[PDB]
Write a protein that binds this ligand. Sequence first.
Ligand SMILES: Cc1c(C(=O)C2=C(O)CCCC2=O)ccc2c1n(Cc1ccccc1)c(=O)n2C
Ligand SMILES: Cc1c(C(=O)C2=C(O)CCCC2=O)ccc2c1n(Cc1ccccc1)c(=O)n2C
Ligand SMILES: [Co+2]
Ligand SMILES: [Co+2]
Lengths: 381, 381
Amino acid sequence: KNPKSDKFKVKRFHHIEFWCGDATNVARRFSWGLGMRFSAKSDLSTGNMVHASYLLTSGDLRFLFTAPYSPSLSAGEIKPTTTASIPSFDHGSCRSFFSSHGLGVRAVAIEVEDAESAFSISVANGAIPSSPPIVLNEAVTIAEVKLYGDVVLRYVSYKAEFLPGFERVEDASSFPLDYGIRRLDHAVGNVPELGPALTYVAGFTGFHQFAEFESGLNSAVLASNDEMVLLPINEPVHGTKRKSQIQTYLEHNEGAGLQHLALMSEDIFRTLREMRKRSSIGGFDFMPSPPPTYYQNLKKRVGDVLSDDQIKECEELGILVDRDDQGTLLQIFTKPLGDRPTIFIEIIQRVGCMMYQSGGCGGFGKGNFSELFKSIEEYEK
Amino acid sequence: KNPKSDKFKVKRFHHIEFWCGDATNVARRFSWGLGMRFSAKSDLSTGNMVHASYLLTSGDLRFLFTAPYSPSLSAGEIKPTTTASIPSFDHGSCRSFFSSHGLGVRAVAIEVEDAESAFSISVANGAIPSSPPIVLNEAVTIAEVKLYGDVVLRYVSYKAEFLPGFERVEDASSFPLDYGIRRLDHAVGNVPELGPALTYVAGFTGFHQFAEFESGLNSAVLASNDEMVLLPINEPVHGTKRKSQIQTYLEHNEGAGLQHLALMSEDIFRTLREMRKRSSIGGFDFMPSPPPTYYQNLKKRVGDVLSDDQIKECEELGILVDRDDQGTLLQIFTKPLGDRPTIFIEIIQRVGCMMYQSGGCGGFGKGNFSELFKSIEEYEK
Ligand SMILES: Cc1c(C(=O)C2=C(O)CCCC2=O)ccc2c1n(Cc1ccccc1)c(=O)n2C
Ligand SMILES: Cc1c(C(=O)C2=C(O)CCCC2=O)ccc2c1n(Cc1ccccc1)c(=O)n2C
Ligand SMILES: [Co+2]
Ligand SMILES: [Co+2]
C-alpha cells in the first residue's frame, strides 16, 4: 500500500557526496573502477580556496568527492565572502568526519521542487537542521538536515552545470569511461536501533514503508511518493552464532552511517565484466561468489526469466538473483570501498514492473540469505 | 670531491612511506598510474588493529601507504602489547600529519648496517630523535629521526618479506603491472631556509655536498659515501617577478616537507608511454610539454648521445634532457599527486658514468631552466 504522503515534492536522487582527505586519489580510483567520467570541478583552479570537489558521472549517477584544503588559504574570508562552492562545507566538520569514520558518504542529495520549503517543513516536522537553505547565484537552492550519524540528507532545487561555481571538466582530461551504470537505486543506513531511526526520518519526510514479501539484521525501507527515492535502514541482530555485519560496521565506523550504495546498471553483465577486469589493477573487488549449488538451483526459480545461457553468465560473474512478486533482481556486492569494513557498493539490474519501471521492482534481495544458506549446506554434502 | 664522511654505514634507499586517511584508494591509484605491484600488507586481515599499510613495488622501488584505523580498535593495547607492525606509528601523529599537509611522504627510509648505531651516532650528532630503535621479531631494527618539517629519516637494518608482521599479498589479488620503474634515485625537501637545513642534516649523517656545474630556488644535494643515497633540499627565492613554486609549496603544505620523488626507469620511453596512456583513466598527469623550439635545439646539445629518432621520441612524450660533464639525463615531471600543489613525482633515466652506474650521473637537470627560458623566447618570436 502506497499512502503517497510526502510532506513536500521530491523528484529524484541528485548526487552522493564523499568526504575525503584527498579527493583527487579517491576520485581517480572510483572513476577507473566504476567507469565514471570526470564531469565538473571546484578547486584552486576555479578559485575555491576552501575545498577541492570533483564530480564523477555515469548515466544519471553523480558521485561528488570533496576534501578540505589547509584553512590558512581562506583565513581572511567570512561566510559572506567565501569562495567555497558548497556553502555548507566546514573545515572542522570535514576533518572530524574523515578521522572519525574514514572514507564515507557525508551527503545523500535528492532533488526537490523547493529546497527552502523542504527544509522548513522538515524542521517543522522533527528534522534536526544541519545547514540552512542558501541560494546559489540566484539559480540553485541548497539545504541540509541530519539523516543519521554524521550523514545529512541534502535538498537541492532549481528555479529553471552541476552547481554554481563548478566548471565543466577539460574534455582532454575527461575520458568517456562507461561500464553501463546509469543511476542510484537506493542508499542504505546502518544504525544501532531501527525503530527510532525510522520514526525520525519518516517523521519529517512523509516517506512511507515500502513493503516486501535469523541472520544479520532487521531492515525497513522508506520511500517517496513514486518510490523512486529509496532509503533503507538496517539495525543489527545480537546474540547470534555469527557476528552481525551491521554491528561490525558500527564498531569500525564509530557509529551509524551510510552502509551501501546500490547502483542500477542497464547491462549488469557488461558492467560486471568491466569492473572485474579491473579489480586488481586499481578497481574494486567483489564479495566471494556463491557455490555452483546456488546456480544449480536457479533454473528451478528464475528459469522463466533468464535463459540457461544467462544463468551460466551469472555463474561466471558471481551475480545473485532474487525474485519478488512483481519482478526479478540481479545483484552483486563489492568488497569495502576503503580501509575499513564499512561502506560498500552494490550493482543491480531490475527486470519487470513496466508501466518506465516502477521503483523497487523485485525488492532488495533479502531472499538470497535463505538461498545462500540452502546452497552452502547443499554444496557441503 | 667526495670526502666519504658518513658517520655510519649507509646502504641504499629502502622504501618511502605515505601517510594517508585511506590507504586503500591511494594505493590502488598509485599502483595503476605507476605500474607498481601489490607486494605485502599489514591490516585487519593480518591482525593489525592499529593501522592499514599496503606496500607497492617496482624493481627495487618500495612505496608504503599507511592510514590509521579508529583508535577504539586498539584501545585495550599498550606499546608492549601492540598489534601495529610499524611500532613508530601514532594515531594522533598520523591524523595531524594528513590534516596539516594532506597526502604526503612521512618517511624516507634508508637501509643501514646497524640501525640502533645509526640512531645513536645521529642523535649524538644533532639529530632530533623521533622514534627510538626497536627490534622487530629479533630480525629487523627500525629507528627514526627528524629530517625536516614532519618528515622523518627512517633507518632499517637486517641481521640476516618487507617487515615482520606483513604478509605477502595474494597472487590472485596481485597483478604484475610494470612500466619500467626500478628504483628511487633521489628524494627532495622544500624548506624556508636552506642553510640551517643543510647544516642539520649533513651534521648528523656525515653526508657531503654533491657538486654540480634567477628562477625559482636555491638547492644543494646531500649524498652518502657512494652517492647512492641522494637528499637534495630547496629553499625559495623571494622578490622575483614570478612567484617561487617552493614558496607556493610551503604555503599549501603548511611548512617544509618532501617535494618530489625521482624514480629511475630502465626505459623512460616505455614508462612514459604507459603512464601517459593512463593519465585520464585514473593515473597521473604530466607538466605541460616544452615547445618544439626546445626539441629543435636538442640536436645541437645531445645529438652525440641520442639519435634523431630518439629526440623525436622525446618530443612526443614531453621528455626533458640535460647534460653534466660525465653523463646525460632524461627527465619529466608529473602534476601534483593529490589535491594540493605540493608533492609530485619525477621520472628519470641516466646515461653514462659506467664503472654499475655512479650516482647522480648527469646531475639533476638544473640546466633545463636556462634552456626552457631560451626555448620559450625562441618560440615566441
Ligand atoms: C547488503 C545485502 C542486500 C541488500 O542490499 C538489502 C537492501 O538493499 C535493503 C533490504 C535488506 C537487504 O539485505 C541483500 C542480500 C545480501 C546482502 N549481503 C551483504 C551484507 C549482508 C548482511 C549485513 C551486511 C552486508 C549479503 O551477503 N546478501 C546475501
Ligand atoms: C623539480 C625540477 C628539477 C629537479 O628535479 C631538481 C633536483 O632533483 C635537485 C636539484 C635542483 C632541481 O631543480 C630540475 C628541472 C626542473 C624542475 N621543474 C619543476 C619545478 C621547478 C622549480 C620549483 C618547483 C618545481 C621544472 O620546471 N624544471 C625545468
Ligand atoms: Co541493497
Ligand atoms: Co629531481
